[PDB]
């Protein structure tokens, strides 16, 4: 056997998308959806598609995509100039790409009222 397997610590492979730090967006405010992409190395391309739309980068349809680079990996933040109820009804999904492979994470921006079990319609 080996007496003291001395070696460097590191990891590689496809882009791993843990989840998004979504929040309780308010009708009117910017619905930012920060994504925790623990990719290493980071992906070469990224696209934000929910239903039939696909925003790679820039600003369009009241959606502003912006990718970041963190020691851990990367973080794709998507801002929404004027978010609407529809936003919640629409499911978000980030699909990144890397020389290693690819991955996708589903995100559903819930509506204000997470820990509020108040009187609901029924």
Curated annotation (Swiss-Prot):
Glycans are attached at residue 93. It is found in: Cell membrane. It comes from the Eukaryota. Expressed in fetal and adult brain. Also expressed in kidney, specifically in podocytes of kidney glomeruli. Also expressed in skeletal muscle. Undergoes proteolysis by a metalloprotease and gives rise to a soluble form. Residues 14-110 form the Ig-like C2-type domain. Disulfide bonds join 35-94. It is linked to A chromosomal aberration involving KIRREL3 and CDH15 is found in a patient with severe intellectual disability and dysmorphic facial features. Translocation t(11;16)(q24.2;q24). Synaptic adhesion molecule required for the formation of target-specific synapses. Required for formation of target-specific synapses at hippocampal mossy fiber synapses. Required for formation of mossy fiber filopodia, the synaptic structures connecting dentate granule and GABA neurons. Probably acts as a homophilic adhesion molecule that promotes trans-cellular interactions and stabilize mossy fiber filipodia contact and subsequent synapse formation. Required for the coalescence of vomeronasal sensory neuron axons. Belongs to the immunoglobulin superfamily. Homodimer; mediates homophilic interactions to promote cell adhesion. Interacts with NPHS1; forms heterodimers with NPHS1. Interacts with NPHS2/podocin (via the C-terminus). Interacts with CASK. Interacts (via extracellular region) with MAP1B. Interacts (via extracellular region) with MYO16. Interacts (via intracellular region) with ATP1B1. Interacts (via intracellular region) with SHMT2. Interacts (via intracellular region) with UFC1. This is Kin of IRRE-like protein 3. It comes from Homo sapiens (Human). The gene is KIRREL3.
């Amino acid at each position: 056997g080996s007496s003291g397997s001395s070696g460097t610590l590191t990891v590689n492979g496809p882009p791993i998308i843990s989840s998004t730090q979504t929040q309780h967006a308010l009708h009117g405010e910017k619905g930012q959806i920060k994504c925790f992409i623990r990719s290493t190395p980071p992906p070469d391309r990224i696209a934000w598609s929910w239903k039939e739309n696909v925003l790679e980068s820039g600003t369009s349809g009241r959606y502003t995509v912006e990718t970041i680079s963190t020691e851990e990996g990367v973080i794709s933040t998507l801002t929404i100039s004027n978010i609407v109820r529809a936003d919640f009804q629409t499911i978000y999904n980030c699909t990144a790409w890397n020389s290693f492979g690819s991955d996708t994470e589903i995100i559903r921006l819930k509506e204000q009222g997470s820990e509020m079990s108040g009187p609901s319609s029924g």
